[model samples]
Target: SRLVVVSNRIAPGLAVGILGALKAAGGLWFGWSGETGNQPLKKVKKGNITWASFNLSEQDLDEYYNQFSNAVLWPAFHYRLDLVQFQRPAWDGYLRVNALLADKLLPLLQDDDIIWIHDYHLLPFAHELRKRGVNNRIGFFLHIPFPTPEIFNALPTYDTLLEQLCDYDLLGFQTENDRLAFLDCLSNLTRVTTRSAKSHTAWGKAFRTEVYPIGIEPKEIAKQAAGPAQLKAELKNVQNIFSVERLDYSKGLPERFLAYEALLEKYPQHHGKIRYTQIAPTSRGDVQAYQDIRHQLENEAGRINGKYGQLGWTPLYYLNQHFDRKLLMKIFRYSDVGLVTPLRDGMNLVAKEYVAAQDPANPGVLVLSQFAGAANELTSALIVNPYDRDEVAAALDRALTMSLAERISRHAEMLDVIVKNDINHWQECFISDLKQIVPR
Candidate 1:
């Protein structure tokens, strides 16, 4: 049986890690090529890989993906109640898009193939597939935190969505808290028997949920850090204090700026010496909420630069664009502090990647969010609450002045956890548990 992996976007560089894993497992990848136009749907084959992509019309792009997926589901799932936008049209469009994807993919699926669906964008895909009696073992893994029942119920289509999710043999979450939240919702909404702690089976579905925290490829980061581009990036003075994340509300970019502002106000001696570079590439731009967040972030960046920036050096250098893994590692290696303070995150890969990219003998300090899943493994990081700017400011102070021996001691512990529990291990553990299920 071949593994069929699917997601919304497929880029050559981003697919490298997943492709390498799939090839090792003798798998095939399928997803949209991210091209929008009136062009016909097409299937392109490259050696062992086969890609199926469909062009989205402008209206489909706006309502279905941008509004429904990002604005409605993304914020709600991540527990950002304020950001969620409830609209009947957006919800209708979301279901329509899912149906379209299922219609396009139905022809490609094989009976023996183990279908693994990724993220919130295609939650109902498994249900749609099952309706056609194509019930090869299917699994769904959510990359973000599942909201509490109270917040989830607020969504008009919560019942419909949860029923759809139950169609999967196994469901995976990033943390135990998320799994608990999901189970609570299921128990309250339906007559399903709730099993607490460890793996529990229900009916013929073998319905089991567990947390499988994702990991980064250390060797890949190390390879990138050793490249020539990394050395050049290190020489660039503005790349001193690095923060990298997709431009999303979940990433505490505004709060991060406030923390930096506090740092400048409290500590006068380090003002001219330290520099900050924020690499936040905009994502889900078609969504109004995402666009609003981007503008708010830009305004915040400008305010910080205007306040503390000197004639010779700007206090903050904000770049709103994407970079390859090699370039990211260069930025990571050159930074004095790796600020990864998300409001809430499933498993922050950037936190682990920064540790892997560092000079082992003398690594930069990692100021992480306590709410992030990475905090569980990386205990040595100076963890802070993203909601509290003062705590983050203090953490920044600690990270900058922490002794070399202390940094080495902390990083060594983190490195051991990361290397032992690599990406392969994560995939193996999740699938192994998933295989135990007897589908209803």
Candidate 2:
């Protein structure tokens, strides 16, 4: 039977895991290609795999993708309740898009073929598939945190979303914390009784949920760390406290900047010495909140540099841009510290990548956020509260001043976890569990 993988998009920007799943599962990558064709749907087939994509109309892009899924659901799921902007039409658009996905995919789905739908963007995907009489042992995975009952109840369409989610034969989360929260919602908010932490009988069907923490290919990143020599040569002289990742609000970029500022204020001697290079390229710029965060970071970065920078050395070398993975791995390798302080995350692969990219002999310290899901596996890292500027600053100070012997020891421990639970292992594990699931 062919595997049918669905998500919001399957185009130019694919996550490392999505590619891994597509390569490992060896099936159809079907979803919005993120392009509007005056034309309808299109599919391009390769050897054993196919790139199957359908376009969203301009209106669908705004209301469904940008507004509902990202602006409203993304913030709400990430526990940023204050930032969500909900339009009634966005809810309609969201369902319409899901229905479109169901209709588009129904023709392609063969009986007994497994369906794997991804993320918050498509909570109702399996339900919609069932509505069109394409059961096919569907599964759903939430890549972000499953919010607590109270927070999830804030959505006007919470009941509908829950009912749709219940339709999945299997549900997966990135952490046990997220899974517990989801189970809470199932029992209380939705009033559905669960048989066990792993099993739920809801909507007159048996369902299962579990945690399968995501990981990256440490060896792939390790190989990438020894990259295009020019970038490495140019960055060799400077000692970097590096964070080059997405500019999403949930990443705590503002808080991260404040922590760096606090780091300078608390330890005045390191002002001209240590540089925090943050490469935060803006995502979801159309959302007002995403724009606001950028301006906030811009001011914060400028404020610190103006306050502490010398004539020759800038205190914070900040850029609102993204580097290719190879360049980023090079940056990660050159760093004296990996400052990944997300307010909340689903097993931040960057933290893992940083650990994997380090040289065992002379490794960098990882000042991680306790809130990040990666902290569960990488307890050896110096975990800090991203919101507490003083706490984060203090963590940085320790990371900077820690003995070389300690840094090597800590990196080795974290690297073992990263290398052992590599993406291949994660992908295989998830698929094995996915196959083992015999839906009632």
Candidate 3:
């Protein structure tokens, strides 16, 4: 039996976990290649692993990936209702893309294969597969926060979307809060009757949904963190605290700038001693909202730097480009503080990676957002309200100046959790539960 894994993006960092597990379990991975074109579908082979990827036409990229998935579903699921842009055309494109993915993947699936679909981009994929009369054990994981019933209902196709998800044999969320929100939406909007903490049964089938908090590949990251290459790069940026994230609206980049500004205002004396580096690579650039966010973030960064920057040291260093995993881990290890303040997040891998990359003898402090799914597990993190500049500023101050003993104790606790429950553990636990619910 082979495990079929699917997702929107297949970055090298994520590939290690997905492919490592797939190889261990004898599986195949397939999805969009993170490319947009009119070229024919292609299948690339890597040893025993087979990767099937497709190219999306220009319009599909705009309507499906950018607008529907990023702008609408991303914000809506993260509880940022105001950021969601409701459009019928985008929804149509989303469905069309899902159908296309189903069609492309159907040939690769087998009767004994376990299909695992990931994240917001393919919510309707399981249903689409079921419609094609292919009902091998299927599961879907929502990698973003599931909003409350009231908020979820705002979308015109909420019921339809829920119905589509019922096609899966198992559903997974990052936290119990997200699972509860999902249950609440089902209870309020559908005829589905679910038992507490049990699999949700609807349409004459039972589908289990549970919290499976994601974990980092600590050993892999640590390998990168300890390398001479990383140490050399770390030496270059010795005096900087950093925040690395994708330049998406959900990451709260604008709010982060405001918080940095507040930090400068509150402690003017430390301006020369401390520098904030934000390496946020631009994503989904075609979307109007994303373009607008980039401008807004740059303007905010400029304002803060103009007010506080000296001839040699700037208050903020904002880089809008991607960095390789080794370089990023090096940045994580070098920084005095890791400021990850997402307005809402599913499971922030950056939070875990930051902790994993630290030198335990003299670890850096992590100031994370209360809204991120990782907060539920990483209790030792100095959690802050991203919307409140003052609170974020105070958290930063505490992280930067905290006692050595306190930092050691907190980092030790988080490191224990990361080591015990890594990416391999996550995959095993999720698949084990799914297998129990849906007999092979």
Candidate 4:
């Protein structure tokens, strides 16, 4: 049977696993093409894979995506309740877009197709499809953390969202913690019947929940990292502490900056030798919170540099721009320590990608956040609490001064996990589980 994958937007960075799955199954990949036009489905064919994308109107983008998805769901899901901007209009917009997408995709779906919807952006997608009488075996994989009942129950449409989520035949989460949290939230609303450890019925809906932590292409990343070097002269004398992510409040950019400062103050002897470079390109710039974060980071980066910078040496470099993936992998290879301390994350593929991009013989250390799902598999990494600046700083110090043997051992352990549970493994596992359900 063919696979039909749906998401908010069709971005190359997020399509690696899904693309492979679609290619194998000769399926349809559908979503917004990151454009704004009230056009029909724009179709493009690449051998066996057919891409079907639609353009959203400006108001739809503003309300459905910008206001509701980012301003509301994204912040709340990441445990930042104060940042959510929930309005009735935005809620209605969310529903309208989901219904519109369902209307667009209904005609294209084959009866035998296995539908796979992705992320919080499409929480109500399966329900919309079901409303259109789509009884295919639909599965959903949330790409972000699912908050506990105490946090999630506060959403204005929490009850509706929970029922909408139950429409899917299967639900996938990045961690067992998230899966249980979701189930726990459902239990608060209604009685949950357990068929097995991972199968359950709630809200008169039969659905199965399981953990399928997302993964990166380990071997592919290694190949990218093996390319000829850049920044050879500038980084020759400096031990680079590297991190890159979309400039979002949930990424803990400000917290990470303070941690770096603590590292500088606590260990002044190595101040001149080590240079921490943070690459955070702006995302959701239209959102006030995103703009606020960018401004805050600018001040924090300047303050740190002003305090510690010497005539020829700057302690920190904050580049608010996008870097190519291959280039990032190459840069990761040269880094001394991969500092990925997100306040919260689903899988934080950068943590795994850093390990994948390392030199096994003289690999760099990884100081990962305990809250990131990647920390579960990459246990060999220096796990630290993101909120604790001192702890993160201490971990950075340890990573910077760690012995070559220890680095190699830790990298080997993480690399083993990455290779064992690679992007292929992730998609394969999810697809296999998804295929097991008999179509309604």
Q: Estimate the TM-score of every prediction.
A: 0.92, 0.95, 0.93, 0.98
Better of 1 and 2 by TM-score: 2
* lDDT, candidates in the order shown: 0.81, 0.83, 0.84, 0.91
Ranking by lDDT: 4, 3, 2, 1
Per-residue alpha-carbon lDDT of candidate 1 for residues 183-274, written as tens digits (9 for 90 to 100): 88877786665466654443334466778888877888888887774545455443367899999888988889999999889987778878
> How many backbone clashes are present in model 1?
0
Pick the lDDT winner. Answer: 4
For 13-101, candidate 4 gives per-residue lDDT tens digits of 56788998887878888898898867457888878888888888989988899999999999999999999999999999999999999
User: Candidate 3 lDDT, tens digit per residue, 114-172?
Assistant: 88889989999988988898968888888788999999999888999888888888998
Clashes of each: 0, 0, 0, 0
Q: List the residue pairs that clash in candidate 4.
A: none
- Over 4 Å off in model 4, which ranges? none
Looking at model 3, the pairs that clash are none
- For every candidate structure, what is the RMSD over all alpha carbons to the true structure, in angstroms? 2.6, 1.9, 2.4, 1.2
The order of the candidates by TM-score, greatest first, is 4, 2, 3, 1
